[PDB]
Amino acid sequence: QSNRYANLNLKESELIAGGRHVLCAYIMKPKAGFGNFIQTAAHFAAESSTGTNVEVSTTDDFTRGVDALVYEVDEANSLMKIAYPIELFDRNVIDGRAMIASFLTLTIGNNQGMGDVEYAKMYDFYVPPAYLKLFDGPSTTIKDLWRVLGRPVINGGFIVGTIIKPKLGLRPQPFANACYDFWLGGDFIKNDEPQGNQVFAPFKDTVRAVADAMRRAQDKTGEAKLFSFNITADDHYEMLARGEFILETFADNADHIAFLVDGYVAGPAAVTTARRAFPKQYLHYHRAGHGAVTSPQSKRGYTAFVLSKMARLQGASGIHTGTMGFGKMEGEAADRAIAYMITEDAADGPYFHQEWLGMNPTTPIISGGMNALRMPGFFDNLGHSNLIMTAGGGAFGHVDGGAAGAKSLRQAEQCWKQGADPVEFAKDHREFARAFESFPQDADKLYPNWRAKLGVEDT
Amino acid sequence: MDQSNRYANLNLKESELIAGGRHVLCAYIMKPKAGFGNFIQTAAHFAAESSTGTNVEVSTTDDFTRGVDALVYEVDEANSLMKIAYPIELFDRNVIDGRAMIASFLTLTIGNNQGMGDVEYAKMYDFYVPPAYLKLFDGPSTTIKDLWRVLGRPVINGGFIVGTIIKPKLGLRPQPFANACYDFWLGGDFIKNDEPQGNQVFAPFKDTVRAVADAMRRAQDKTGEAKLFSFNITADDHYEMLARGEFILETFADNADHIAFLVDGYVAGPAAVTTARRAFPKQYLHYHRAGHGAVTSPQSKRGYTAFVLSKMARLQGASGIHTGTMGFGKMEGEAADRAIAYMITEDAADGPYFHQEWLGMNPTTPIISGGMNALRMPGFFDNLGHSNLIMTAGGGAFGHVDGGAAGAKSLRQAEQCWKQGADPVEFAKDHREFARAFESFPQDADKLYPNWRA
Amino acid sequence: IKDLWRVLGRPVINGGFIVGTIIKPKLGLRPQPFANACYDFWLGGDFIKNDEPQGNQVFAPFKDTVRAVADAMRRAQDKTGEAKLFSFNITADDHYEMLARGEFILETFADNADHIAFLVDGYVAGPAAVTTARRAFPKQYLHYHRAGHGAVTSPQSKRGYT
Numbered sequence A: 001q002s003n004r005y006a007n008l009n010l011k012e013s014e015l016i017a018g019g020r021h022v023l024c025a026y027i028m029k030p031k032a033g034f035g036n037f038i039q040t041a042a043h044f045a046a047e048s049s050t051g052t053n054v055e056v057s058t059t060d061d062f063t064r065g066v067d068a069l070v071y072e073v074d075e076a077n078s079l080m081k082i083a084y085p086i087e088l089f090d091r092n093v094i095d096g097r098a099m100i101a102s103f104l105t106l107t108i109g110n111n112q113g114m115g116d117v118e119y120a121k122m123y124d125f126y127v128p129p130a131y132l133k134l135f136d137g138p139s140t141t142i143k144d145l146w147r148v149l150g151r152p153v154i155n156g157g158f159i160v161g162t163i164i165k166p167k168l169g170l171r172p173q174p175f176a177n178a179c180y181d182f183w184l185g186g187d188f189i190k191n192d193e194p195q196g197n198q199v200f201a202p203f204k205d206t207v208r209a210v211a212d213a214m215r216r217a218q219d220k221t222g223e224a225k226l227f228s229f230n231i232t233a234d235d236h237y238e239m240l241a242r243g244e245f246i247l248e249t250f251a252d253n254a255d256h257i258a259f260l261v262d263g264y265v266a267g268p269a270a271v272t273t274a275r276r277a278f279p280k281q282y283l284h285y286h287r288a289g290h291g292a293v294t295s296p297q298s299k300r301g302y303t304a305f306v307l308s309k310m311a312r313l314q315g316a317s318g319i320h321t322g323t324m325g326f327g328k329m330e331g332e333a334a335d336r337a338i339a340y341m342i343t344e345d346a347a348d349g350p351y352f353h354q355e356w357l358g359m360n361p362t363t364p365i366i367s368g369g370m371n372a373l374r375m376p377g378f379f380d381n382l383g384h385s386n387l388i389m390t391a392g393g394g395a396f397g398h399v400d401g402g403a404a405g406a407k408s409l410r411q412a413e414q415c416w417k418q419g420a421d422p423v424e425f426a427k428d429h430r431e432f433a434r435a436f437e438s439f440p441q442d443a444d445k446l447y448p449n450w451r452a453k454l455g456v457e458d459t
Numbered sequence B: 001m002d003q004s005n006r007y008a009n010l011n012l013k014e015s016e017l018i019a020g021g022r023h024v025l026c027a028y029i030m031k032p033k034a035g036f037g038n039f040i041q042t043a044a045h046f047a048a049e050s051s052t053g054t055n056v057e058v059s060t061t062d063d064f065t066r067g068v069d070a071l072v073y074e075v076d077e078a079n080s081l082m083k084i085a086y087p088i089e090l091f092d093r094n095v096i097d098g099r100a101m102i103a104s105f106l107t108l109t110i111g112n113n114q115g116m117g118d119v120e121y122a123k124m125y126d127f128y129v130p131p132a133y134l135k136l137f138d139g140p141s142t143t144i145k146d147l148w149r150v151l152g153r154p155v156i157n158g159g160f161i162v163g164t165i166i167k168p169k170l171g172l173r174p175q176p177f178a179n180a181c182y183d184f185w186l187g188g189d190f191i192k193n194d195e196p197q198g199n200q201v202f203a204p205f206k207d208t209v210r211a212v213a214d215a216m217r218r219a220q221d222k223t224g225e226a227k228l229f230s231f232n233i234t235a236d237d238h239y240e241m242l243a244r245g246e247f248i249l250e251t252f253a254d255n256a257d258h259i260a261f262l263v264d265g266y267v268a269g270p271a272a273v274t275t276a277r278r279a280f281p282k283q284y285l286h287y288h289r290a291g292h293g294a295v296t297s298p299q300s301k302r303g304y305t306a307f308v309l310s311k312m313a314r315l316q317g318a319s320g321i322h323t324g325t326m327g328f329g330k331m332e333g334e335a336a337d338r339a340i341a342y343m344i345t346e347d348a349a350d351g352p353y354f355h356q357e358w359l360g361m362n363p364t365t366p367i368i369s370g371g372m373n374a375l376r377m378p379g380f381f382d383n384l385g386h387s388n389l390i391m392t393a394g395g396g397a398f399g400h401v402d403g404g405a406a407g408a409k410s411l412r413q414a415e416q417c418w419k420q421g422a423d424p425v426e427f428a429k430d431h432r433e434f435a436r437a438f439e440s441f442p443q444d445a446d447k448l449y450p451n452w453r454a
Numbered sequence C: 001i002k003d004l005w006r007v008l009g010r011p012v013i014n015g016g017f018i019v020g021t022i023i024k025p026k027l028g029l030r031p032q033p034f035a036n037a038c039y040d041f042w043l044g045g046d047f048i049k050n051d052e053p054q055g056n057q058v059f060a061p062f063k064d065t066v067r068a069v070a071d072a073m074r075r076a077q078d079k080t081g082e083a084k085l086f087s088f089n090i091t092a093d094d095h096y097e098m099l100a101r102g103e104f105i106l107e108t109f110a111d112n113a114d115h116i117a118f119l120v121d122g123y124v125a126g127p128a129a130v131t132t133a134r135r136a137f138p139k140q141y142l143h144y145h146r147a148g149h150g151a152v153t154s155p156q157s158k159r160g161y162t
């Protein structure tokens, strides 16, 4: 088994050059009292490809040729790298294309229940051209949103967004009134992830009231407005019904619609339903639930980097990549590498370089405890603002309301792009300055002398 | 922000919340992150991020919204326990048929709350579904009773279904695969696709399905007994899942009611499970949970346990789900996991925190699998209390010294030994295939039956 | 073309020239002689196109020709070690016939399904036929064949459009 499933003589550069293997890098610890590191890594490769925990009479030479192989170990750093012959992965009968479900079942499936492994988490993976080209990839990108907004389709810049808050509770007309207010100052509105067809806010009534708010805001401002609707369901046919109803209702504003799918909880099947049924609608991948495995506190499953890289292959137009430590959710500054892996044609993960061969980019959607004050620091860490940022609390929690909240987000990115000092910039921008008084604990930490500098009382 | 006043009401009585029938209840083991809020403050912010709030006050909140807030109604900080009540009006329903969706239950009760920067961890150990919400779930349409009927067994307590998994997990070409099916079916009842088996370039789906259909006819002609197969129809594309399923049923023809459909429900998700449940309600839906250990392991302090996963699967309409070997096999499991089996088979059962009435919703079968063999079976059944289930032993059948068929008969004989209350070593002298499992897995025999070499 | 260059293993930016042919005679070749001419060209070239009227004629049934061409593609790819492409005419008056043809081709080609282009006689069958292929099969290269266009586009014509 250590002879069969482990070949540490293989050179990673040759496995990449050969283009016949998917590579996976894991941080793994063997359970005490079982096998050594290479034995545990060999049994892990067996349970992730062609074997079980005992020898079987049915094994032939052909089977041995599709074995996953351990090609590199670094026991001191708990690192194991496995090469998966690409012929292992399932393909559709209908169109010969790849499926992420098969990648998941083999590379991070049954190997997560092994009694002889304490834990194992995937940190990176490499997809060679012969397998990458079989994935859907995104059909709609931020370029399509920039075109609807009248922005340049190359570096069209920042899309000012929000989430309708409360997360649940608003009836159809109060919901649509909050949409109208935000759209007086902002571009994009997203359903909060569970909003759909609740008994107090029926889906068709809310969709119609929002379509009317979009027309009213566009007439008032003379600017195009965008909405991302949650179409998540267990039933594929419910997802189609929701999507079809939205496009028909929005009519001449149908290209202003994004479809949101809770891709981690509903699964890859739900993401593909939206991607294949509505390829001309921006597919917004919401990752609620992902923290159960992606948290740095978890030593199992896979990281947010791996989740995001899979989503690009699945065809997400955009995916939540987190605030990279600048918001309310778990995240780190080094998470900027996630955003570049999903937007660039060539990028480096923690272990593998990836060429995307012209596959469309996936937008990093920034969200979770963001507001005007936290934005300049976020953009400094990332390096660009060609993205969507949604701030629910940061817009509707603004002291002067959602419209002022939307302008504070707009003004916060204009401050960063100009290279201005946020406190100095706030004296000329009322809505941005009023975000300091809306979130005073954040202002005290990020800009310690803001009260004296903006001429406001209290502390 | 301290959201305790709004999102915590520890004066609520659990018995009254259950009697009211207007709330879903969830019990979590939670630890606040050091240097942030106290236990109640963290539990209140958790309830906020799981229902109607965010991390700051918003101008758009009204009294109506406050009425659908999730509420912390019980805390036991010493045992890291938090219980939250979710008004059932929070949960999404289908526009097409007004029915519930597990995706919404997951998004609210174990979604964004798993990324909170002020929580070290939080894992769901139990949940309660009141009648007004339970009745909106699909529940299973096909059960073990339908397999017992195809096998010619009594439809009440029809007993043990002897199964295997076709090993190698991947690598077998279509005819060698079907030859291993024929061999096992000479002694056993049920064969399962190993979870990733589908349309690989070396074993095309249609060729494998046709070769297996021919092996089923040959084994049934030879033995005079009905045989069952569970095919993996998992795909990202709903239409691929339909194409696979439709092709299998048409090919199997007069044996179409001998087919189960396997879905890798944890990796492909609830959407894939529902595709199979709603498109093929008359085909036994076999929920394979590959990947689940990333959250269900006792080593994980996040997500949800295997008990919670299994209870959701029954609501989703799984006919059967892998419940693990309860510590008797190769995967992580514990003897107390027998409570998982009762929660999914009985009409009334107790979880670690909540009693559940199922109101006649069909049972889900415990599918026992993962490092099982004829030697480990009598101990497993003693712990569970019955054998009205499917057990699949891949290595335990194809790893038997005399082959598949002998492997199958040792699984059959091992359950017959348990039902008779016989001593396995004494029983083995009269049952050759059962005795030859001792020599097939000698390390297991040395631990379970120390003086067997005789 | 970037998607064809990727299947050919060429750079996806300026991947260069795709060497192609049309299976002649325009009509008359039975399924195996047709597929034998595909195999021969593919020993030296990249792309083969159905001549514009080739489909389901009584002497070259569609399913038989599609299967014989799928076998010739596998044989040429095994022989040369290079990827090969085919553009199939799926033109029909009936939208559902266009879907049946396309679906049958993709299922038959299986692991070579991304080597398939769909040809539509867009000028004679019309924009409705072009959109059927574009919307039903957006991941298959849509090859617009303009047979008939000369009736208006010719410089001799002073009507219609160029």
Ligand SMILES: O=C(O)[C@@](O)(COP(=O)(O)O)[C@H](O)[C@H](O)COP(=O)(O)O
Pocket: A163, A165, A167, A192, A193, A287, A288, A320, A321, A322, A323, A328, A329, A366, A367, A368, A369, A370, A390, A391, A392, A393, A394, B049, B054, B055, B112, B115
């Ligand atoms: O429900 C929420 O909490 C949010 O709407 C943010 O609202 P706020 O702006 O008010 O905080 C998003 O779903 C989270 O950002 C998801 O986290 P992530 O992006 O990390 O997946």
Ligand SMILES: O=C(O)[C@@](O)(COP(=O)(O)O)[C@H](O)[C@H](O)COP(=O)(O)O
Pocket: A052, A053, A110, A113, B165, B167, B169, B194, B195, B288, B289, B290, B322, B323, B324, B325, B330, B331, B368, B369, B370, B371, B372, B392, B393, B394, B395, B396
């Ligand atoms: O691939 C495997 O390992 C198995 O086929 C068992 O094969 P063996 O009989 O040879 O061990 C099953 O998928 C596991 O039982 C899944 O674990 P669980 O039931 O816990 O979901």
Ligand SMILES: [K+]
Pocket: A007, A008, A009, A010, A011, A012, A071, A072
């Ligand atoms: K090496």
Ligand SMILES: [K+]
Pocket: B009, B010, B011, B012, B013, B014, B073, B074
């Ligand atoms: K209480």
Ligand SMILES: [Mg+2]
Pocket: A163, A192, A193, B112
């Ligand atoms: Mg949200």
Ligand SMILES: [Mg+2]
Pocket: A110, B165, B193, B194, B195
């Ligand atoms: Mg398996």
Ligand SMILES: [Mg+2]
Pocket: C022, C050, C051, C052
């Ligand atoms: Mg021609």
